[PDB]
Design a protein around this nucleic acid. Structure first.
Lengths: 127, 124, 157
RNA sequence: ACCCACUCGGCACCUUACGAGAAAUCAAAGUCUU
RNA sequence: GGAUAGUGGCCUACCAUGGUUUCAACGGGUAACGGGAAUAAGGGUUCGAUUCCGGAGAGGGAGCCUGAGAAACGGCUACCACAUCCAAGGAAGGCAGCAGGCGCGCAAAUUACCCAAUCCUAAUUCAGGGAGGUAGUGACAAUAAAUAACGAUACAGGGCCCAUUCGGGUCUUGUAAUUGGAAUGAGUACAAUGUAAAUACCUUAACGAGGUUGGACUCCAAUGCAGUUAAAAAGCUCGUAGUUGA
């Protein structure tokens, strides 16, 4: 009934217990994709190795801080006056921040699509 | 108020733990905020007791700590980090009514107004 | 209170220079926008930071500004308030002998006398820059300033 | 068949080395600077 | 064809059936009177000036008027209406081009000065210009932000302050004493950028020319949410609209 906070709220819902991560939703190009931008910036471990009905693709080891919770968010705007502003979601300006936006082009990160001046939807936000 | 002044740039500002949390989880640029309101170079600092207290908060609320351990605030090495943040600042400013205090602790502010010559800052 | 001891401070500046009001308010606000707009450096060297640079930096000023440095003029926010204050005849015209002591000064500034190298300057809060010319002018003549020239050694700051 | 353990099914309950909320209580109202 | 001055269904006819139209046409609904400059690495800024633009009213109606040239407002008439003077008889009169009083009644300066310009009309001059201008009034919005202090002396009580509880701080402070410049303000020609007159009111110039509080004379501070409870969960399930929805 919503594959996003579904599983990001299992990593989230996990590292708070502390451990070695577990299973999740079913896969999703998106699940896997965030469960990418995460790893690629750090935080998580190694997206994993399942394959079923749609249960396929991955589990996903934990590792590191990643504290706390991947951000799920449930609206979607962006760009200029925007992005910067919903960068108030962030756990503080002075670096730290990362806002895994959805960018017209690319499921990208607060900066990773700050990149070539991009924008669009607000998928989430990490650490 | 009969208080002789001798404050000179850069202002020395002790930032307390509450203010730090607050500015962090609401994205308020604390450094620039102080330079703005004081309208002069500011040396922004935090006592060891305040930052220790943050350290405990930091166990479940990551983000205040890093900003609070930033060079922008420079550590004030008090002799008594074990004393609540409030009392720490009070005992440090009681001999140095020189330093400005930025705190969200309206209780700490009230008892600092007593001391002549203590600029007080806070976030609405 | 800090409000209180402030309302002290202001009265301190109230003849730390010479005023009688809230021209301390004038200079204050000034210091704001000066900083303010300035402090909005921010930023880089945007060819803008450039013009604005030697720009606001050409605040100097004579009797005015700093001395030789910056860049960071927020120093002023320290000074300015406590510095921009002097400079002008309101200040830097007692600190030049002629004036027997601020008061005994503004009065001539007004009262026709006291003139900046040709033309008086009643505006008893002008500003100084390249001062060596801040004589009496006078045009029987400006008395209080013409003989009490004990300023004949007014080598001050 | 009875029992025995042991599994996994899921039974409901009960329980807090956890999270809460504004507290009594809660494996939720735990639950994303409050 | 006829009007139209002269284009035109504009009409006389005469007929063509036309064609408009979801790109919504017919059409509807938005009191709708109605909307020019330029800089500009970036920025700096700004303009024309309360609509550049630009159709429809000048009791009602009518008809008519001038003419290069009016759907002529501010020409008529006549009609209506109002609507008035009166020797009885007749004989008026429509100033959203002004001001004004009523009223309206929300809301704002004398029924200023000049046509000084610069613009106007205009006949061969220098007609006339309700243009314009000038004022005043006028925080209007206002600004400005600059207006009794500088200094002579004596005389000196000891100070006076603290948080003060006592300690401490230390030390001018009163002359309701004796000096300061021919301080300065205000009038006087002063012509005047100058309403060729405002032109003495400006700008001169000068000539002259200083008197809140508290405390008993006193006395002092500004000239997106907790969510059980504590305010808001239909019995129970079902489910539509809806909500969402690899």
């Amino acid at each position: 009934s919503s594959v996003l906070a579904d599983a990001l709220n299992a990593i989230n819902n996990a590292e708070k217990t502390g451990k070695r991560q577990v299973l999740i939703r079913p896969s999703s190009k998106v699940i896997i994709k965030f469960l990418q931008v995460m790893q690629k910036h750090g935080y998580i471990g190694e997206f994993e190795y399942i394959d079923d009905h749609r249960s396929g693709k991955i589990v996903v080891q934990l590792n590191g801080r990643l504290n706390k919770c991947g951000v799920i968010s449930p609206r979607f705007n962006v760009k200029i006056g925007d992005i910067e502003k919903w960068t108030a979601n962030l756990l503080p300006a002075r670096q730290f921040g990362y806002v895994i936006l959805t960018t017209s082009a690319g499921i990208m990160d607060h900066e990773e699509a700050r990149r070539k001046h991009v924008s669009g939807k607000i998928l989430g936000f990490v650490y | 108020f009969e208080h002789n002044e001798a404050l000179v740039p850069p202002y020395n500002v002790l930032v307390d733990t509450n203010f730090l949390s607050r500015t962090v989880g609401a994205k308020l640029p604390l450094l620039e905020s102080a330079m703005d309101c004081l309208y002069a170079s500011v040396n922004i600092i935090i006592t060891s007791c305040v930052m220790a207290e943050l350290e405990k908060l930091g166990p479940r609320y990551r983000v205040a700590l890093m900003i609070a351990r930033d060079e922008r605030w420079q550590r004030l090495t008090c002799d008594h980090k074990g004393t609540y943040a409030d009392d720490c600042i009070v005992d440090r400013v009681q001999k140095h009514r020189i330093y400005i205090v930025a705190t969200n602790d309206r209780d700490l502010k009230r008892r600092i107004r007593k001391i002549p010559g203590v600029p007080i800052m806070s976030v609405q | 209170s800090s409000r209180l001891d402030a309302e002290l401070k202001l009265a301190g500046e109230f003849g730390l220079k010479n005023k009688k009001e809230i021209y301390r308010i004038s200079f204050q606000l000034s210091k704001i926008r000066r900083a303010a707009r300035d402090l909005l450096t921010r930023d880089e060297k945007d060819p803008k930071r450039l013009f604005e640079g030697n720009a606001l930096i050409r605040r100097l000023v004579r009797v005015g500004v700093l001395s030789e440095d910056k860049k960071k003029l927020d120093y002023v926010l320290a000074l300015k308030v406590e510095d921009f204050l002097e400079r002008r005849l309101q200040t830097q015209v007692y600190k030049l002998g002629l004036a027997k002591s601020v008061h005994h000064a503004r009065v001539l500034i007004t009262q026709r006398h006291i003139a900046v190298g040709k033309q008086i300057v009643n505006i008893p809060s002008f500003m100084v820059r390249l001062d060596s010319e801040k004589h009496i002018d006078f045009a029987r003549p400006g008395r209080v300033a013409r003989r009490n020239a004990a300023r004949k050694a007014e080598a001050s700051g």
